[PDB]
Design a protein around this ligand. Structure first.
Ligand SMILES: COCC1(c2nc(C3CCCC3)c(C)c(-c3ccc(F)cc3)c2-c2nnn[nH]2)CCCC1
Length: 133
């Protein structure tokens, strides 16, 4: 499956504008500072129709499992309770989180040997780049 290109363990190597994205989302100062220091791993695997994405870090270990197009409840690493839907659109995993009349989108793209992750909240974008670990 086309989704195979995502499978593996990916380690954060660069981040841009993540603090301002986090402010836009509404993340509090202490969480911004501690989460911003971390170099998480993103562990993606597929079993049948179920995709699992784990985030492992000094800050928080999180895991989501989902089927594309099927909404699920997610507690985020900043402790928001959101409703999420993940789809594949033109080779990009598109993750929408909805809560309190707000929305943020996280797009995961394979580019070269990297996983490029674009996070958008209103007018504010952050890009985070992960490489195989
Ligand atoms: C909207 O979600 C964006 C992402 C994410 N969001 C957040 C919140 C702050 C903004 C709202 C959620 C946090 C704290 C982390 C995180 C987790 C552990 C950490 F140790 C550091 C940051 C991660 C993250 N997870 N994995 N890599 N970054 C970035 C790309 C992927 C998921």
């Amino acid at each position: 499956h086309m989704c195979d290109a995502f499978v593996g363990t990916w380690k954060l190597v660069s981040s841009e504008n993540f603090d301002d994205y986090m402010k836009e989302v509404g993340v509090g100062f202490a969480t911004r500072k501690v989460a911003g220091m971390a170099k998480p791993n993103m562990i993606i695997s597929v079993n049948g129709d179920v995709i699992t994405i784990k985030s492992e870090s000094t800050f928080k270990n999180t895991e989501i499992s989902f089927i594309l197009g099927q909404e699920f409840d997610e507690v985020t690493a900043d402790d928001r309770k959101v409703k999420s839907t993940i789809t594949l659109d033109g080779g990009v995993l598109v993750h929408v989180q909805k809560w309190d009349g707000k929305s943020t989108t996280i797009k995961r793209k394979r580019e070269d040997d990297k996983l490029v992750v674009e996070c958008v909240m209103k007018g504010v974008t952050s890009t985070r780049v992960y490489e195989r670990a």
